[PDB]
Amino acid sequence: AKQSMKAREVKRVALADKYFAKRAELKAIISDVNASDEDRWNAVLKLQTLPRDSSPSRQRNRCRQTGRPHGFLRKFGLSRIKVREAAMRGEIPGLKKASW
Amino acid sequence: AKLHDYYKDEVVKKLMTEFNYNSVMQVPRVEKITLNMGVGEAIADKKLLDNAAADLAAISGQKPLITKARKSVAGFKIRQGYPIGCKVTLRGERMWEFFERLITIAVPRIRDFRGLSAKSFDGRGNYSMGVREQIIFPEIDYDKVDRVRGLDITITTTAKSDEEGRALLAAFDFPFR
């Protein structure tokens, strides 16, 4: 069922890009600001009317090659096992076994 | 006798007009209000029956009467002559004092209310109702009683018909559905 989870993750990054920069920041700040009153209440209402998948917290970091939820490292964008094999094939630049 | 003085001043003439009686005596009245508690755990814990009796003694001033079982029954594991229930019959001014108290305080104090069944009459004009929680009466202090039991209130009335009985209680402004 890995493909279905990936199909969802591509929808979540698409919708978040669609909505994060258009309304997410403004609705949060006009709710947070102390000077704003009454409108901060209305702002929360329209926020819940949104799809809710836009939230960046709905996104879960996953390897591109093997779509694996756990073991993901941001810098390589790969799961731990994928990073190890790629490093030995020389695919990852500057990555060597570490001794100290 | 707060609800009594009201009855003989306003209720009597109210029922008199809408029924076209020939005599004031014909107008129905409330004879007695028996309050009944039943403890099926009396055989298990005789102390619980005493506590229930103490609750009824608080609810109504008259001291409670312990009802022994009428006949031995196999299903309920009871034997004849064994104390099982607790009953008080109120017939005097104390009947009116309980009646005015029940409508003014106990019925509002019930948690969720949707009306009292007008249909719940014995068919001889005598209204019988059931109380789910004894704590509704303010007599017993809340959280000062072991368990929340219940009681059964019966309004024996002179009325020979349910229709006469409902109007008598309705005239008192009883909370019918």
Binding site: S31, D32, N34, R40, W41, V44, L45, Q48, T49 | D112
Partner: protein, 84 residues
Amino acid sequence: PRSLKKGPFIDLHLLKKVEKAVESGDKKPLRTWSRRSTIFPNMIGLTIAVHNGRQHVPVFVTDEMVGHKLGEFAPTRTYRGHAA
């Protein structure tokens, strides 16, 4: 706890249905899956059946209930006892 600045939390569908019932008088229970919504004074004296995974469980709102969440009263798991 939600921050005081953000105010109380309520769901649009829940609040809209509550206002739709109050204007038309109490008549039927509001069946909702919103356990996150806070108990509000506007919905006191009404039976809101907050959803429990298997089936909604009816709750009658009271004054002491306000200041607590709808789900907080509702059962969320069944564990009668370890013994049969």
